[PDB]
Amino acid sequence: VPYYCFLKVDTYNSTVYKFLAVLPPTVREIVITKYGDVYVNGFGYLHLGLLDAVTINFTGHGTDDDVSGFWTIASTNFVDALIEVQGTSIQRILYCDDPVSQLKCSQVAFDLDDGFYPISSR
Amino acid sequence: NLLSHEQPISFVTLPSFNDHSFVNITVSAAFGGLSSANLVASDTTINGFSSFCVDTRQFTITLFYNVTNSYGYVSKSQDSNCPFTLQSVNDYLSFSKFCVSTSLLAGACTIDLFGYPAFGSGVKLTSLYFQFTKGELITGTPKPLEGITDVSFMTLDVCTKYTIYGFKGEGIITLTNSSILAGVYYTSDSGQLLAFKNVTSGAVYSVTPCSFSEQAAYVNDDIVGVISSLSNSTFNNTRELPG
Amino acid sequence: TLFYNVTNSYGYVSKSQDSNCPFTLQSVNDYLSFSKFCVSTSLLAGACTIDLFGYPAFGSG
Amino acid sequence: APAVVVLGGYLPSVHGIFLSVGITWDNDRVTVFADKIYHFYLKNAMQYVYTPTYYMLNVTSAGIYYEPCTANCTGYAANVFATDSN
Amino acid sequence: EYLQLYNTPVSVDCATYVCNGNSRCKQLLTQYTAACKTIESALQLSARLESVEVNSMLTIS
């Protein structure tokens, strides 16, 4: 069937249901941010308050599909990274944690011609 | 394009059933004085309360006026410190949250409603304070608009007055088989909509403006031919060239 | 310093600020400098506004 | 499809039993393997499994060809990696 | 007759100019995609071109 999905909002002596969407059969990532944002397939559907925590109770995959190998939960922090996107999909990543990588991700280049490039002191 | 402003309206939004609540706003006042017309006993309510916040994915705002002028009629106007007017909120505007109050709210815009009981300086009947956030889930609407899996409607291949995920314009919407795996809409560097998904299906649709630019060959005070992207035009012959 | 003395029977209140102003109450404390400074509950001549809001049951404050 | 893939959980060579089919339990969840494989939520050959196990296999369309796998086999599957330092 | 051979080249560190070394501003500046690249490399690739033209017409014997 089509699945109609709701936030059950619980408060000190109440429950309310806010309707979200007819959830498409084609979701592949959910990312929930500490600052309240929930992004589904890379798009930010929801904004919410600061979160203390999340509980999950995910139910195992539908065993008529391939259902071999792993699905992954990543605990993560925000960082500036240079990303190359093709067809909306990440091809490559570079992390601006060091002064050679901060040069690359200031010139928006994964690799550079020899030269003198302006950099700030650390 | 010859369409004489008979053009269809289109509305594409994240998949919904008809999930509708009205924000009925009642404004009330009484008037008196025989030397000049002046205002007493004003009150305002939103669904019968003093403040309201929308939880349903569609709403309509309505004004009811319940004005009792002895001089026979009242004319009415609005001042808006706001990116909408009440009658415009209904014309498919999309929000993340939307709350309305007869008293100030943290970020609020004001719509002030005025009555002119004897022509000259009017009087404030009420002030409505709107707190809202630009977003995707809650849409203003004219009337509860029917559907079971989706609320959306499109006319394809014809110039349409579209609202698509909060982008407004005139354009031709065409199904393209260039499926794209992330996001919901794709925009130019110019911040204009180029394509969007019907996210309950995966199908992607492309938006093109319904009048394209051309160059007119003008010679001896007539247009003798036109250079175009289009396969058809008012001239009786057409020729295809590489570009 | 702000003291709130709010007596909500529903157990708690969240509180927020709007500034038509080049500061916020806790930022005035962070070494700002002035030639004069007056505060009132009623409108002073050149004045900016800080408006203080409570949310006693969540939604409209 | 005819592909090369890695899988794990509790499965053959306390948290599960296997027979010649089987039952496995962890984290308030029970998985039953029969002709089809099933899941349930429940608070807390005659072969017994005490520790998680991994297998790497490649498919003949009959999946029958495989090698048992050590620690650190998870990094073969395409949607998982060993996270680097920092 | 006087003929100018060269212009004294100038270079900018766009993050230092725009943000005064404020970290939260650098974090915002990276959202303006390649605004810095398209300033810095226009000044650096021009300062390089002057260096190779002028040092290559000043062939001493």
CA distance B34 to A116: 85
Q: If you search the block for the tokens 């212009």, which residue do you land on?
A: E7
Is the CB of residue A119 less than 8 Å from the CB of residue E13?
yes
Nearest CA in chain C to A49: C58
Q: Which residues of E touch A115 (CB under 8 A)?
A: 44, 48
Q: Which of B99, B104, B131 sits opposite C51 (nearest CB)?
A: B104
Query: Contact at 8 Å (CB) between A36 and A51?
Result: yes
Interface residue of C13, C14, C58 to substitute, partner A, most A CBs within 10 Å: C58
Question: Residue A24: its chain B contacts at CB < 8 A?
Answer: 15, 199-202
Whether residue B53 contacts residue B99, with contact meaning beta carbons closer than 8 Å, is answered with: yes
CA closest to A7 among chain B residues: B55
> Rounded to whole angstroms, what are the CA distances from B197 to B97, B105, B164?
23, 36, 10
A46 alpha carbon, distance to own chain's centre = 13
C-alpha D60/C-alpha D80 separation (Å) is: 24
B232 to each of A73, B212, B240, how far by Cα in Å?
55, 12, 11
Paired tokens of D78: 């395409």
Searching chain A, which residue's CA lies closest to the CA of residue D28? A57
DSSP D36: S
Q: CA A67 to CA A90: how far, in whole Å?
A: 24
Beta-carbon separation of B55 and A18 below 8 A: yes
- Among A3, A26, A7, A25, smallest CA distance to A17 is for A7
Give one DSSP letter per residue of B22-46, joined into a string: EEEEEEEEEEE-SSS-EEEEEEEEE
Residue B108 CA to residue B102 CA, distance in Å, equals: 11
Is B105 part of the contact surface with chain C (CB cutoff 8 Å)?
yes
The whole-angstrom separation of Cα B129 and Cα B51 is: 9
Q: How far is the alpha carbon of A37 from chain B, nearest alpha carbon, in Å?
A: 12
Going by their DSSP bridges, the two strands B58-67 and B94-101 should be labelled as unpaired
- E56 phi and psi angles, rounded to 5 deg: -95, -15
Q: Looking at the complex, report in whole angstroms how far the Cα of residue D31 sits from the nearest Cα belonging to chain A.
A: 9
Query: C11 at the A interface (CB within 8 A)?
Result: yes
**Considering only alpha carbons, which residue of chain B is nearest residue A43?**
B183
Tell me which residue of A70, A69, A62, A60 sits closest to D4, measured CA to CA. A69
**Nearest CA-CA distance, residue B207 and chain A, Å:** 19
CA atoms of D49 and A18, how far apart (whole Å): 45
Closest CA to A46 of A6, A85, A79: A6
Q: Is B104 on the interface with C (CB under 8 A)?
A: yes
- Compare CB distances from B149 to A2, A45, A87 and report the shortest one's residue: A2
Q: For residue B170, what are the β-bridge partners?
A: B161
Question: How far apart are the CA of A75 and the nearest CA of chain B, in angstroms?
Answer: 21
